Amino acid sequence: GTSKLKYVLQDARFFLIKSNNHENVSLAKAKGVWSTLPVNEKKLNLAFRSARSVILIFSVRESGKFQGFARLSSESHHGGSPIHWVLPAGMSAKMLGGVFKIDWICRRELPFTKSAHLTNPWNEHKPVKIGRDGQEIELECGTQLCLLFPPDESIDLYQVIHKM
Numbered sequence: 369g370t371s372k373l374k375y376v377l378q379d380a381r382f383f384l385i386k387s388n389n390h391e392n393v394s395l396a397k398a399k400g401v402w403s404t405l406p407v408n409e410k411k412l413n414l415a416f417r418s419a420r421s422v423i424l425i426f427s428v429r430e431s432g433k434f435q436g437f438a439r440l441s442s443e444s445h446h447g448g449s450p451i452h453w454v455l456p457a458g459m460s461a462k463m464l465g466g467v468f469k470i471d472w473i474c475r476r477e478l479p480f481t482k483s484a485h486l487t488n489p490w491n492e493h494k495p496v497k498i499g500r501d502g503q504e505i506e507l508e509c510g511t512q513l514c515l516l517f518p519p520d521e522s523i524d525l526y527q528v529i530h531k532m
């Protein structure tokens with residue numbers, strides 16, 4: 369069902385994550401971690417303290433799709449396993465310092481064609497697929513977007529609810 373999912377999304381905050389390549393999203397799904405640039409890292413740390421759930425919605429640039437969504441389980445933390453991110457052009461490993469732990473809620477894809485009816489008030493009511501890395505998505509838009517993804521029956525949200 370969708371009842372536990374709706375409970376996790378209650379009063380959540382949502383952020384669009386834009387990755388330049390598929391390898392980093394695959395790594396994030398395997399290891400339960402994400403790293404972003406310092407401007408977005410500061411925003412996510414503030415949001416994590418402010419809301420019962422902070423949801424990252426992932427899209428690989430040029431894929432025409434979202435690749436899933438996950439809930440922050442921690443603020444960013446430095447020191448340890450230099451996650452073997454595949455660095456794009458103007459990207460250092462010091463920029464991707466700061467590792468958040470995340471719990472995946474859905475690892476299934478959603479094509480942009482399915483979200484064309486959803487606009488984001490925090491980005492001028494442009495279609496929710498449009499936005500820079502770190503763009504916040506308003507509650508109602510974000511909730512509806514997450515509910516469009518195919519159910520991921522491999523995930524049990526019982527443990528996620530207990531983190532809350």
Ligand SMILES: CNc1nc(Cl)nc2c1ncn2Cc1cccc(Cl)c1
Binds near residue numbers: 386403457458
């Ligand atoms: C593991 N984290 C990330 N991995 C990848 Cl491949 N792209 C990311 C990531 N975070 C933001 N972006 C998009 C981007 C923003 C500004 C400059 C560049 Cl070159 C790319």
